[PDB]
Structures are given as C-alpha cells and as structure tokens.
C-alpha cells in the first residue's frame with residue numbers, strides 16, 4: 001500500500017507501486033489501471049452520402065482556432081489527473097466548450113463534467129438527435145511528465161492537446177449546421193474529453209463501464225491521440241499520412257474510417273498496431289462498443305517529446321491538425337445521419 005493493479009494483457013494482472021507504474025510507462029508498456037475494479041455487429045455505410053454538405057462545412061474549419069486554444073491549454077504547468085492543475089485545466093476546457101455552445105444558440109446541446117475519484121473530471125458534450133443511438137468522438141485532456149508526474153512540467157501539446165483542439169473545432173463547426181443544432185439528426189453525437197488517460201485509461205473506463213451498465217447504445221467511437229507531429233514523417237522522407245490503428249478496434253468501423261479519410265482528407269492512410277491499453281478506444285472496446293483510432297503518423301514516426309517538458313506547441317503542425325479536423329467532421333456528420341446503424 002499503495003498497491004496499484006494493472007492489466008497489461010487480456011486477463012493478466014500485476015500489482016505495482018506508483019513508481020513502478022510510471023517506470024512501465026517509460027518503457028512503452030500500456031495497461032488498464034483496474035485497481036478500483038479489480039476483477040474487471042454494426043454495419044456501416046459503404047460510401048459517403050453527405051459529401052456536398054460536409055465539403056461546405058469543411059470550409060468553415062479555421063486552423064487559427066486550434067492554436068488559439070492549444071497555446072493556453074499547454075500553459076497549465078501540467079494537466080496531471082491527480083493534481084489540482086488537472087482540475088483547473090478541465091474546468092477551463094469546460095468553459096471553452098460552453099462558450100461554443102452558448103454562442104451557437106443550440107437549445108438542446110450541453111456539456112457536463114463526469115466525476116471521478118481524482119480531481120480532474122472528464123467532460124461530455126452532447127448533441128441530442130432523434131434516437132439514442134450514439135456516435136462518440138474522443139480525445140484525452142490530461143498530460144503527464146513521466147520523470148515527475150505530480151509536479152513536473154507537462155505542456156502536453158501533441159499528447160493530447162492536439163486531439164482535444166481537433167475535436168473541439170469539429171464540434172464548433174458541426175453546430176453551424178441548422179439540422180444538427182436543432183436535434184434533427186437521426187442519431188445522437190457526443191464529444192468526450194477523457195480525464196486520467198495517462199494513469200491507465202481511468203476516465204474512459206469509468207465512462208464506458210457506466211454506459212454499459214445503463215445500456216447506452218454506442219454505435220461508433222473514434223479516438224484521436226496525437227494528431228499534430230509530422231516532422232518525424234518528413235525527416236524520414238515518407239508521405240504525410242493519417243495513421244490508422246488496427247488492433248483492439250472494430251474491423252467494420254475501421255473500414256468506415258478509411259472511407260472517411262479517402263473522401264474528406266487530402267492525405268493517405270497508413271496502418272499500424274499500438275498494443276494493449278493503448279488509448280481510450282481500448283476502454284470502449286473492453287466494454288463491448290465498436291471503436292476506431294486515428295493519429296498523426298506511421299509507426300515509429302510519432303512525437304519523441306511526449307511525456308516530457310518538451311511536448312510543446314512548437315512541435316505541432318497545424319496544417320496536419322486541420323486534416324484530422326476534416327476527418328472528425330466527416331465521421332461525425334456521416335454517422336449522425338446513418339439511420340441504419
């Protein structure tokens with residue numbers, strides 16, 4: 001005591017100290033932290049159906065908005081989920097989401113905190129549709145410095161500030177569609193900003209456990225974690241691409257994600273695996289929901305600065321973030337209007 005229980009592979013657990021937990025992370029191992037829960041097909045459209053509408057919404061994306069939000073978000077000393085910094089950064093992000101909702105005038109759209117047993121709350125923004133079939137867009141809002149998690153500097157600009165501002169800007173543009181804002185889409189859309197991802201997927205485990213216990217009908221979940229770093233790709237002489245993960249994800253949903261990238265982005269896809277417990281999509285998968293995951297690059301070309309003080313906004317390519325904004329908008333809109341899910 002304190003003893004943390006980690007799940008490193010299906011049905012395989014290890015009891016560790018907190019220091020050993022961060023040492024595992026530093027070696028590249030991921031896991032679910034299951035300390036508090038110690039014993040714990042959908043067919044998609046074959047092609048895009050709303051190309052004219054989505055192409056017009058894409059013209060409203062503004063890459064200056066990514067940097068306007070990411071700069072002050074990264075100025076929190078860290079956004080560590082067990083720190084008062086992480087409570088304050090979540091409250092700040094909640095205020096930014098609320099400013100977008102209030103300025104849209106969309107009567108039924110809300111954001112609410114999801115409480116956890118640590119100071120940093122997750123955030124869920126909801127766009128009600130005509131049915132409770134739900135499409136989820138996710139990113140994690142916490143950051144960590146693995147050499148000193150509680151008090152170490154962690155700007156978290158790429159990991160995962162980039163994903164946060166990607167889906168926040170897609171959320172803003174979605175609310176400019178009159179039918180979506182009025183609640184007339186056949187399906188409900190939610191934007192999730194997960195707390196405590198760096199501690200072992202703590203916030204997304206809580207959310208999808210509760211959704212499963214309440215029989216929430218999640219028809220698709222897309223996670224984005226690190227959407228901004230292209231220098232590794234360009235240094236290697238490789239084509240700028242959207243990375244698509246192929247393990248711990250739903251195969252049909254991943255095929256649909258590639259349809260979305262082919263239709264709405266101007267760069268190609270590149271497949272990789274990233275292992276067990278890799279990001280918050282793994283929590284959706286664990287609790288039985290179909291999930292997919294996109295990120296910045298091919299395997300091994302991602303930011304080498306993550307989990308340190310050097311994960312700064314100067315490493316982020318906002319033209320690449322814009323490509324992820326386009327795919328987020330297309331994924332959300334096409335599935336919001338997929339009445340056969």
Ligand SMILES: *[C@@H]1O[C@H](CO)[C@@H](O[C@@H]2O[C@H](CO)[C@@H](O[C@@H]3O[C@H](CO[C@H]4O[C@H](CO[C@H]5O[C@H](CO)[C@@H](O)[C@H](O)[C@@H]5O)[C@@H](O)[C@H](O[C@H]5O[C@H](CO)[C@@H](O)[C@H](O)[C@@H]5O)[C@@H]4O)[C@@H](O)[C@H](O[C@H]4O[C@H](CO)[C@@H](O)[C@H](O)[C@@H]4O[C@H]4O[C@H](CO)[C@@H](O)[C@H](O)[C@@H]4O)[C@@H]3O)[C@H](O)[C@H]2NC(C)=O)[C@H](O)[C@H]1NC(C)=O
Nearest residue numbers: 047048049050051052053054055056259262263264265266
């Ligand atoms: C959703 O909706 C959106 C709309 O919002 C849809 O957008 C459409 O998307 C498609 C696909 O992405 C686009 O098609 C592609 O468009 C470009 C057109 O680019 C213009 O420039 C060309 C180059 O011109 C320069 O160079 C010439 C050299 O001769 C100069 O003379 C010029 O001055 C320029 O400097 C130009 O050639 C094009 O002209 C053609 O189109 C006009 C407009 O209709 C005609 O007047 C012309 O006569 C001529 O037909 C154009 O003005 C093209 O480059 C793409 O063509 C390639 O791909 C075709 C399909 O594969 C293929 O048949 C062509 O031969 C061509 O192939 C060439 O390129 C390949 C690589 O790309 C090579 O491998 C190959 O060897 C060959 O060299 C293609 O036409 C639409 O433009 C775009 N439309 C709009 C309105 O935005 C979107 O499709 C929708 N999505 C869905 C439904 O999923």
Ligand SMILES: [Cl-]
Nearest residue numbers: 159225226306
């Ligand atoms: Cl990471």
Ligand SMILES: [Zn+2]
Nearest residue numbers: 159160225226
């Ligand atoms: Zn991350």
Ligand SMILES: [Zn+2]
Nearest residue numbers: 159198306307
């Ligand atoms: Zn991380």
